Design a protein around this ligand. Sequence first.
Ligand SMILES: CCCC(=O)Nc1n[nH]c2cc(-c3ccc(O)cc3)ccc12
Length: 251
Amino acid sequence: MKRQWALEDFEIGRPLGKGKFGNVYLAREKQSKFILALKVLFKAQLEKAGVEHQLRREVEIQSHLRHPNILRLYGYFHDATRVYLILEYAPLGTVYRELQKLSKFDEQRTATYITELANALSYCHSKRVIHRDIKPENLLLGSAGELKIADFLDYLPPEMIEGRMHDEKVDLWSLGVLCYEFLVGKPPFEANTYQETYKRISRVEFTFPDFVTEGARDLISRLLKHNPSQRPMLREVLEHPWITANSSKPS
Ligand SMILES: CCCC(=O)Nc1n[nH]c2cc(-c3ccc(O)cc3)ccc12
């Protein structure tokens, strides 16, 4: 059995974002007055892009994922022409916004984010879920500033762009790209053209600014290994001395 939700059950607030298949609004559940976000998807648009099959597959997975660093999908419902997703509300916004405001993150904030991401990714893997889009724009912040993965070229690993087989190790690479962007302000393989970026990634060609410490370089260099098997395991990330020295939160 399950709960039956309806549009009438929520008081719609301000728009939080405008996506390709619809809008996300802040909402208040009429009964409990609980604050949450309502993602409104349009069927006509989902069909025209034949992503329906994908939406349905992500919703099923997202429903079974319960982790403090993963945005919660509370439920869903639909009507004549729209599909509604009931989501957790992250009051402090996106890491992307924070990154743009600060230009770059200090070691403590970065180490903490990487710790939360590694824990979320470890949980995902334990549930056979892999390849999460953890770009800054897909990362939300909870009431206490805790990270929340919200995913319902600069970050693709060599194996994917080179047209090869990939596994959970792609998430390790992603973590490396993010750690660098957090500390630096921009992803490591940025270039003028897609072609140049692909080449930068394939050859694992990137440089460190002078303010990136030895500990960070060690971790990032290890995560960004061309050969997936050479990349550390998530628990090794969590035990990395740079992480245990700077993370304001335990694993
Ligand atoms: C200061 C306000 C901060 C804010 O907007 N916070 C948010 N809480 N919950 C969300 C869900 C999404 C979302 C994610 C993925 C998706 O497909 C649809 C919607 C986007 C943003 C938020």
